[PDB]
């Protein structure tokens, strides 16, 4: 197997995924880390560290906002970004070979469960210990300022920060993440799946592409792949918090009104 045609084919799959990923997701990790660590020559993100700076940066570039309190205005924006995300992930999923040929209801189910874990995964790219990059790198909202927000809003992100800190320590790049993300979407153990075997078949192929990618791209980290498989369970565990915090719009938050798409992804889960 070492350097056979099958291994060459696993690289072709990896590159295909990575290209689809470049195309699906406008801001990549490489681009996000360049801004986060102040490497760019040209970037200047707007920093939101308090209520006043929030007033200033809010209109980076109408009647969506109304006259609502800050914590709610913020999470209205969080709802939209996340709808953009779901749409990009959906498009990315469709580029995974074999995906569009699965039963359509199984596609749905896979996205329904996979999308939250992928949001958590990709958000880490946009986070350091201090805050998170927003509006494609045009803004940065501090962790501290998000903590200052009234309950329940003030501790939405905090768990996302904690996950990000530990996941970022693994130093995956965008080519590693493309395969990892695909593996997550093609999970054969979601509830309600009709045809589990063709899904497990695509995933096993993806898991192998992943294993090879990590050996070639991270030759000094012998346990990386084992660590990634562990983050997969972690993700399943963290996402239930997220799922529940978005049911808080049952009530209170009688002025929230959840985005129709997010409602669909949350219910009967």
């Amino acid at each position: 197997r070492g350097g056979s045609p099958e291994s060459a084919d696993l690289r072709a799959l990896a590159k295909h995924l990575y290209d689809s990923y470049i195309k699906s997701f406008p801001l990549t990790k490489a681009k996000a880390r360049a801004i986060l660590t102040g490497k760019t020559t040209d970037k200047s993100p707007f920093v939101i560290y308090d209520m006043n700076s929030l007033m200033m940066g809010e209109d980076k570039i109408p009647l969506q906002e109304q006259s609502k309190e800050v914590a709610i205005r913020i999470f209205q924006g969080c709802q939209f970004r996340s709808v953009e995300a779901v749409q990009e992930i959906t498009e990315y999923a469709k580029s995974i070979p074999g995906f569009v040929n699965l039963d359509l209801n199984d596609q749905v189910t896979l996205l329904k469960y996979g999308v939250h874990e992928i949001i958590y995964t990709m958000l880490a790219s946009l986070m350091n210990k201090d805050g998170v990059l927003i509006s494609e790198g045009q803004g940065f909202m501090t962790r501290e300022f998000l903590k200052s927000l009234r309950k329940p809003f003030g501790d939405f992100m905090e768990p996302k920060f904690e996950f990000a800190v530990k996941f970022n320590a693994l130093e995956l790049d965008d080519s590693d993440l493309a395969i990892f993300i695909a593996v997550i979407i093609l999970s054969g153990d979601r509830p309600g799946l009709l045809n589990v075997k063709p899904i497990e078949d695509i995933q096993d192929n993806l898991l192998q592409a992943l294993e090879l990618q990590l050996k070639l791209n991270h030759p000094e980290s012998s346990q990386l792949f084992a660590k990634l498989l562990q983050k997969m369970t972690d993700l399943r565990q963290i996402v239930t918090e997220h799922v529940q915090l978005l049911q808080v719009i049952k009530k209170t938050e009688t002025d929230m009104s959840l985005h129709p798409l997010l409602q669909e992804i949350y219910k009967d889960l």
Partner: peptide
């Protein structure tokens, strides 16, 4: 499946 379906079907 409604909305996710719709996204999944749209050539795009």
């Amino acid at each position: 499946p409604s909305l996710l379906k719709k996204l999944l079907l749209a050539p795009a």
